[PDB]
Symmetry: D2
Subunit: 333 residues, 4 copies
């Protein structure tokens, strides 16, 4: 397994949690802003996901989580991380700042084998587990796991497209706050709305998902786009997809198609519920997309609104580990 | 004017604030749960809209707001409210619990002339200022001012339909919390999602707008429906309308048409902005619907997503005074 | 064990969770506002404490949780609950509405043996596990488990008093929202501040703890009082106790005394931490009181501020089960 | 007046709003992170205090607010700000990062006459209006207006000390979130509790007030200290002061003394209320400290808890204009 993590943030830390849950091996973490003793504290306590049940301590300049020793670096520059000292070969690139092939390829200076960007990439091939993993090939050295919204949207869009044909769709994500937002009104020069106080406001915003699903399901390129409203919750978001369909159908056919896929090819990626759920019901949910049967509405035989929940931190971090596992099987690693 | 208010809640008090701003005359308030000394405090201090600038005191069993004496009653059953005795003939029925014609008609027993339900009604004719006021018949004794969402959606839907034709549409409102929600998970037997802790959750809910807009614009009956997500903000909501249009157009045509209507026939009802606004920017906004030019997205020549803001408490309260003014002209009063 | 629960609210439901965790047996639940199918949903999903991991279903008009069948009643009046049909003998009185001996004794009409009020009582003897359980005697038929703040304060006050003498103290609880609070400004006639919108405000409020610790530790009667600020969090609260002490001491002596008690006589009731904890770190914490070593300040040898955390829902519900277990040992039941 | 603002943040902008209300003259603003077109948006729209009523536009490289041209600069290093060229001689240093005399003195390089740090200083003399302004020496080139908490605490502590003598006291401020807090758990290396998600948590923190009040009232040096809990509100905080008094008194004496000071020497600095107020009632409040008569508690003749509110953004911003006005009189300017 031999995973390294660059950026021990919300996703960096929860990928480490997901790796331990899945028996994957992380050997090295890099973050210039989080010293080793502070890394112990940040991994141990999580306001959203609860205290890590397990021993976490610093020992001999390494982070030790349940007996596994994780080498810690504190390099500002990715090209200076000595990944090969720790034996890290598959690097999770989770800073937010090194998303292109050019930028992510800095990790090959330290001896990394493969880099997985935990965000959309302008040029690295993008993957959503359950949707297009079979297009991965072992010569791809830098890949992307797309965004949390793309991972919720792409499963549901795949089911709708295979069964009924998406002629065109528009989506909204009602989206929890992230680390890029601000506690009170402050400077966000490249996104003025995103600078307004996160706890006070519904904030219109862009979404990664819009473009990205057109690269993940190329048949849908240019037939889907959408936007986000950031709202004052700390985690868990919901896709609200309005689609026009090519084939006439009832809402029962939509539900039966989603149910059948969640039991078979999309098992573990797409969930299905008919309960009266609210967003707190998905905190810590492992799935990429949970179809909410009761919340959706069909106006006519070809125009419908479908609602699907995702823990944007936790479900995504579990898919990073799923993607790395797939890549190492194909690579033989 | 000779307005009485039944139910001195969020809408009841802000209707009095709006009447004061618009020089309307409120002569009587009734609320069994809010004794006179408490009405002073409740009217003076408001967490969302700020302290009432001006004098509120109790004298002689009356609420005296800026010189005006308002007779206070504390009746549980509307039958027993002496409206006659205070001279209240136009009754704002803002309790939430007497919405049908037969239930609202109880105010006639104490000599009310007309009742205005401040919510959708199963059978009282619904009006939205700027959209269908000319349907108001002088012989209508119980009318409805529809919901906060219908008052936002109907202006924008009017413009789109007149210019481009709405073939079908689906709406979401991302809606602030209201008084029927719960601070922590508790019993809401008729709406199980709506009982979950309001501050913790994105909560799927129904919208009044779903029924009402096909009544207010009858040619759109059956062509439009939608749902709500309640999110943890205290006030100000946003309509997200995804429409399939009859006529090919660009997004510039949609903008130009909304700008022209806000300057002309829909002036004061529909507003227009191109600023990078967020929900807090509309707290205290007088308009029913404020079109957000920059947040909308056109996918194709006939498929588009339009975003409009509304202060669900305040814009609505001002519309209730507008409705009464219009009714009084038609009745001659 | 043979526990019945009256009021299946935040405390009613979490006492059921605590009973299952501790292997205690609940046989009957009464709530007139929550029908059986709705009880399934409310027990299964918890916005604060996460989904119940376990099977919950309605079967043959009973609630079935992990194989245990729990008879459900829906009586408005406590004297009409046929507790003996279900074999319920120890009743948790968790409505909030039947707190005196007179009111709580209604349950003896249905065949209850003992009633435990999950709130301060004006006359029923009040108990805090770890502090005064040894004053319980088997002839006491109605008892109280005091409030969540009293359960946090009393352990810490006991340690300080035994070691250093409390001459006098004043406390504040910075306290999460409860079900008595309101989503937006509405009527709370007996507590005007408590009616103001809970998510918008710091709200000064009274506390149960103030008086109650004087009944639980009678040596401290009249030497302690205090108040609450309700703040916009959904659970977890913190006591901030300013004490003048009879014996001169350093902060190290305070910490060593708290540490020694958390390892011995107060084990499981009083916790001890020296980490940089925040309130989310205590969600689901079992203890009544967790001393925060780093947050406290000693101004002089006899004047100090001590800070102690408590999950006001969860820690309290576990103490209800602890108190019932103690009572059945003393009663032989 | 000839005021320049360095750092157009929460305090920098509200200081300009306060200068406009008080007819002070701001001539220049500097912020490297906020370009002129963005300064218009940031000044016009405010989530906490509402939209600026009046004209804000950019013309010719200047910010024009109600007719006034303000020269805008975008310098990173204060040394390089041409204050001379705009005529700015009294500089509000509101960046948060140039708080020491030597760091603040950089503004003299571009011809500033005086600097006012809008935060406590390790060595610049601190002033609180109404408490120690007469200590201001004309030869003081760098002064401090202390923190929002010192400006609340010092007026109330002055009154108590003058009338009853403070023997020792311990304070807590329940403090709104600020810009140094984080929207979700993230790195705050110097304050680990302060990095945890602001909207989710009660967070123990330090207070500026702890140091500063013994400097502002030197006879209370060593007799007073305290701490903060940061809670999820956007603005408005509350001091909770527990004091041991030298002279026996009743709570009526404390009330009478606070009322007399707010009418006389501390008028406009200290306010007094007996209403059932909550934090939202003070948003936009001009005063430094508003004594809450009803929330305080006296335990004995010498031991009492006093509660005072403050709008930490707005009251403070107005005090900065007061301080500059006073300094200009003493300097003759
Ligand atoms: N938050 C979510 O729900 C979520 C989900 C999926 C994807 N993402 C994506 O993952 C990335 C990180 O997001 P996040 O939410 O974890 O943010 P975050 O701010 O919590 O984490 C970023 C981390 O990277 C560290 N860092 C910054 N510069 C570094 C550098 N030069 N070298 C190494 N480490 C550095 C920071 O200290 C921080 O700990 C982004 O691209 C984001 O869009 C976020
Ligand atoms: N809150 C909004 O944004 C909004 C906007 C538009 C319309 N409305 C509608 O207005 C109505 C009231 O809503 P609200 O937000 O003001 O709720 P609310 O709870 O604030 O007010 C309801 C008021 O009615 C009073 N009341 C209850 N029974 C009474 C009775 N028998 N007689 C007289 N008064 C009584 C209550 O004491 C309370 O003060 C609802 O139908 C709601 O759908 C609400
Ligand atoms: N919330 C906490 O942190 C906490 C902690 C300790 C103690 N308490 C106390 O426990 C009691 C309940 O508090 P809560 O937070 O669970 O409130 P809650 O509102 O969540 O629960 C009250 C429950 O009692 C039910 N009920 C009302 N009348 C009834 C009746 N006539 N018969 C039977 N059931 C009825 C309601 O439907 C509701 O489900 C109060 O006395 C409260 O002060 C609360
Ligand atoms: N927020 C409050 O309630 C409050 C009240 C009183 C005092 N203060 C103090 O005022 C100071 C600023 O606080 P704030 O709340 O306004 O924070 P903030 O983050 O809103 O504002 C800081 C501003 O300084 C700017 N800045 C950063 N570096 C700069 C530089 N090198 N030159 C010029 N400008 C630069 C930033 O762009 C930002 O706009 C702090 O010292 C704070 O403690 C805050």
């Amino acid at each position: 397994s031999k995973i390294g993590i660059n950026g021990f943030g919300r996703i960096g830390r929860l990928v480490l949690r997901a790796a331990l849950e899945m028996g994957a091996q992380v050997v090295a973490v890099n973050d210039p802003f989080i010293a080793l003793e502070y890394m112990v504290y940040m991994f141990k306590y999580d306001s959203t996901h609860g205290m890590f049940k397990g021993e976490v301590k610093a020992e001999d300049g390494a982070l030790v989580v349940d007996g596994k020793k994780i080498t810690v670096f504190n390099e500002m520059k990715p090209e200076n991380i000595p990944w090969s000292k720790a034996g890290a070969e598959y690097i999770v690139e989770s800073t937010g700042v090194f998303t292109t092939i050019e930028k992510a390829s800095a990790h090959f200076k330290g001896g990394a084998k493969k880099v997985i960007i935990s965000a959309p990439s302008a040029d690295a091939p993008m993957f959503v587990c359950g949707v297009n993993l079979e297009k991965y090939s072992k010569d791809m050295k830098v890949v992307s796991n797309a965004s949390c919204t793309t991972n919720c949207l792409a499963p549901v869009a795949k089911v709708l497209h295979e069964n009924f044909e998406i002629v065109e769709g528009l989506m909204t994500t009602v989206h929890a706050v992230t680390a890029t937002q601000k506690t009170v009104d402050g400077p966000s020069a490249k996104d003025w709305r995103g600078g307004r106080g996160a706890a006070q406001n519904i904030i219109p915003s862009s979404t990664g998902a819009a473009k990205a699903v057109g690269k993940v399901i190329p048949e849908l390129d240019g037939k889907l786009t959408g936007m986000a409203f950031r709202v004052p919750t700390p985690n868990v978001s919901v896709v609200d997809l309005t689609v026009r369909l090519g084939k006439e159908c009832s809402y029962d056919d939509i539900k039966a198609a989603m149910k059948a896929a969640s039991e078979g090819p999309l098992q573990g990626v797409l969930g299905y519920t008919e309960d009266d759920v609210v967003s707190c019901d998905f905190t810590g949910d492992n799935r990429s997309s949970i179809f909410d049967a009761k919340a959706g509405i069909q106006l006519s035989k070809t125009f419908v609104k479908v609602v699907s929940w995702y823990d944007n931190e936790f479900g995504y971090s579990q898919r990073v580990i799923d993607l790395i596992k797939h890549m190492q099987k194909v690579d033989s690693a």
